Design a binder for these strands. Structure first.
Lengths: 148, 41, 10, 108, 129, 141, 47
RNA sequence: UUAAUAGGGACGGUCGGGGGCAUCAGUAUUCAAUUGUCAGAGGUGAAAUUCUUGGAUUUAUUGAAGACUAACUACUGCGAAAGCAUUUGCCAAGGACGUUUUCAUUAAUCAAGAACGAAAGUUAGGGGAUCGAAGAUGAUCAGAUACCGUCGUAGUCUUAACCAUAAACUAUGCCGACUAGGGAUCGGGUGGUGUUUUUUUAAUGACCCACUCGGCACCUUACGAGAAAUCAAAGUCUUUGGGUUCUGGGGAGUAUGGUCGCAAGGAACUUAAAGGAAU
């Protein structure tokens, strides 16, 4: 529940907390001690109120699932470094060929460009706020890369 | 129901030997219980 | 005691 | 192994020896290694003697090397208990689990 | 590091009388240690003692008859006036006249009653009782 | 007792109690002195030279046999060191350590062992400045 | 006083991020496509 | 003037899994070539994804890659600590021992600052065998075997810089004296002795006993200390001075006119009820 409450830029911010925050607004409510529940659970417990934004944001659930996984492999590593991992370019490489139907070193350079103008690649994935990923999500869409 | 926690005086051949060949001690209690009461009475 | 007694025995 | 325990091999035709080594279960070194060995033996050999009576085997704790003699299922019933102590389970808890397996042996 | 050779000597003598030793060895030697020893000697706390000189700081050997109930050094060596002396005898001696407080005065290192006898005063070295 | 180390070694030399020349010694004091200057002229130090005289000439102690310390004999004949012997080998010792570090920069202990050395040099250099044996403007490297 | 203006500074910035959010989301709808053929980022861990 | 069983440096033979740069070996893991055979191989408490009739697993001849030094391995060794186990060479460094060599107080404590600082983490290259946070997916049956299996990113290795945190422990400031016995071990030195050794190439060992320093430690005990656990220091004759730096004056439950920080946003109603259940 603290993970869900974690804002963008928090150490406690997590790959989950981004999903729930943009699809819904989460408000912390009340804390219940371990002694309250019997047989006692070692884990601490909480109650939280969550409301889904209405109308639902007009964004594809998988696209941000695509962005959110690739860049939050490591929060404290750079977004570019999470990009720079060999595997993700390869997945993005088959992805780019799909849109052309709709040279791997070339797309990696193109991915490297959209990183440099955005400047989010240098910044830390956890530190970046939720709005930046929306702006970041757009730049790849403009270049023609959709993460999913 | 209790476990022995000391060295088993019987070796494996002997316990396997025992297996090949409600409780007697429990009746030995009953007999000596019976003997006392007849003496008490 | 404990490990100390064992190490003493050696 | 004791001679009388070894004679069971001549007496029986379905008794085997199971041998393994503590570092195979978990990489223990120094005093951590020594403590694990003590747990298998226990105080005054109480723990092994419990493993000995219930699972119907013999176990030789030769330094870090353990050898278990008995029937195939019985040596396997001995092995996990030995493994459990190595991985950190207290002797008291396994003594309870050990006395549980001791029951199903006598019913069956 | 060495701070007071006299302190070392007195502690060694104290331990020697603790453990029943009829002799004690002191190193290094010095005139202050020596003069302290004749003061104790003349008051009877210690017996015969001998100086072993080895062309270097030297050694003392002291015979002990078990009558030394304490020997101590007052560090750092405070200056003492004639009017102050009794205060010191009150602070360092369990009783008035049992055991003696050692002053180095312009006439040398001696105990305190001589110091009132010659009306001399000076710096404090220690106590014996 | 060692600084910059935990060693408590006590091994050393034991000067004999008697400060007079040995009875068996039957060599003129002057013939010793001419040996002292020749070895120093060859380039040998007061430390090594004493070993040579003691090892092969029966000179138990230059002061005992001749009445003067060997530095004074060498100085009296015009032979003196630029800097006191203790400091000079400390300087050469640090130089050998430093020359080692350029070729091997990952010698991180040698980097530490270096630090222990000039700290010894600074303490020794400081003392020699106070007594005026070493000119005040002198600084290490 | 100082607390109130700080709240207003937070509030107006709290408004400004929304209108930026609205504009970006408004721009998203122009560039939209299906995902069925697309290889999910779930595959990155598999390698 | 001494030359502190203070100290520095020297020099002689040793000693070390102390450090760095190269170098050699070593099985093991994975992969690849060839080689003979055939149905499962793998894995679990039990099973399923998975590989396999283009031959899996297993058999042998090799080759390649990256890690890493089993057994020998011990209350043993080195280093300030963190840490350091293949061979050989190079570079310097170091404790202890010996010295009838050398300075002559050069010393103890301590701010800032500086060097080092397990593992994890960070920037930018290389490498990527194994293991492996994350993520994916199989199974979700059974409580001792109850969280396993397959793929596996970052990481695990290294280069050049950051991060400076551990139960980084004697859970225990430093320097210096004195205050019990005993015998095991490591390095050095001294004497004796007779076994192993061996001879005009050179060169020098091993064991036994005895002494003596320095080191990891160990057994029995304190005429002392502590309430005790215990302490050769956590001891220094009843109450107190050898030198010096730093630090101090229990378990739960309620509230908040005291602060520091946190979100987004543009339509009820039925009979209350046998108007029911009923093998």
């Amino acid at each position: 529940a603290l993970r869900l409450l974690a804002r963008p830029g928090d150490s406690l911010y997590c790959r989950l907390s981004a999903n729930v925050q943009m699809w819904a607004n989460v408000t912390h409510i009340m804390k219940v001690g371990k002694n309250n529940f019997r047989p006692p659970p070692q884990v601490e417990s909480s109650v939280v109120r969550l409301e889904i934004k209405n109308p639902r944001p007009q964004v594809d659930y998988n696209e941000w699932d695509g962005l959110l996984r690739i860049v939050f492999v490591r929060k404290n590593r750079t977004i570019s470094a999470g990009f720079k991992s060999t595997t993700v370019m390869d997945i993005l490489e088959k992805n780019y060929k799909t849109f052309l139907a709709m040279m791997h070193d070339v797309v990696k350079e193109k991915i490297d460009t959209v990183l440099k103008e955005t400047d989010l690649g240098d910044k830390r994935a956890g530190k970046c706020d939720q709005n930046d990923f929306l702006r970041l999500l757009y730049a790849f869409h403009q270049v023609g890369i959709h993460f999913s | 129901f209790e476990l022995s926690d000391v060295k088993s005086s019987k070796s494996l051949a002997e316990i396997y030997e025992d297996d090949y060949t409600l409780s007697e001690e429990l009746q030995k209690a009953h007999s000596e219980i019976s003997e006392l009461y007849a003496n008490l009475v | 005691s404990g490990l100390r007694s064992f190490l003493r025995k050696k | 192994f004791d001679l009388d325990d070894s004679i069971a091999l001549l007496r029986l035709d379905d008794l085997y020896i199971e041998t393994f080594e503590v570092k195979d279960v978990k990489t223990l070194t120094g005093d951590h290694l020594s403590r694990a060995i003590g747990r298998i033996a226990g105080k005054d050999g109480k723990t092994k003697f419990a493993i000995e009576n219930a699972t119907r085997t013999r176990i030789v704790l030769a330094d870090s090397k353990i050898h278990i003699l008995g029937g195939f299922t019985h040596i396997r019933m001995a092995r996990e208990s030995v493994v459990s102590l190595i991985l950190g389970s207290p002797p008291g808890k396994v003594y309870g689990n050990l006395r549980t397996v001791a029951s199903r042996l006598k019913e069956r | 590091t060495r701070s007071s050779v006299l302190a070392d000597a007195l502690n060694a003598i104290n331990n020697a009388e603790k453990t029943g030793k009829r002799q004690v060895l002191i190193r290094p030697s010095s005139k202050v240690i020596i003069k302290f020893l004749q003061v104790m000697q003349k008051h009877g706390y210690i017996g015969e003692f001998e100086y072993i000189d080895d062309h270097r700081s030297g050694k003392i050997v002291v015979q002990l008859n078990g009558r030394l109930n304490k020997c101590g050094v007052i560090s750092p060596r405070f200056n003492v006036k004639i009017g102050d002396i009794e205060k010191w005898t009150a602070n360092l001696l369990p009783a008035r006249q049992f055991g003696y407080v050692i002053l180095t005065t312009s006439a040398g290192i001696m105990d305190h009653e001589e110091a009132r006898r010659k009306h001399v005063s000076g710096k404090i070295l220690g106590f014996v009782y | 007792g060692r600084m910059h180390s935990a060693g408590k070694g006590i091994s050393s030399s034991a000067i004999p109690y008697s400060r007079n020349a040995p009875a068996w010694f039957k060599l003129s004091s002057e013939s010793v002195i001419e040996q002292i200057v020749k070895y120093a002229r060859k380039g040998l130090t007061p430390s090594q030279i004493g070993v040579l005289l003691r090892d092969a000439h029966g000179v138990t102690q230059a002061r005992v046999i001749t009445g003067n310390k060997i530095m004074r004999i060498l100085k009296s004949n015009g032979l003196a060191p630029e800097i006191p012997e203790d400091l000079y080998y400390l300087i050469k010792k640090a130089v050998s350590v430093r020359k080692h570090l350029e070729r091997n920069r990952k010698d991180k202990d040698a980097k530490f062992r270096l630090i222990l050395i000039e700290s010894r040099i600074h303490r020794l250099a400081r003392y020699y400045r106070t007594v005026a044996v070493l000119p005040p403007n002198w600084k290490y490297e | 006083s100082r607390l109130k203006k700080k709240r207003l500074d937070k509030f107006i910035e709290h408004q400004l991020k929304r209108e930026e959010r609205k504009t970006i989301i408004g721009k998203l709808q122009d560039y939209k496509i299906d995902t069925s053929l697309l290889t999910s980022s779930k595959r990155l861990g598999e390698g």
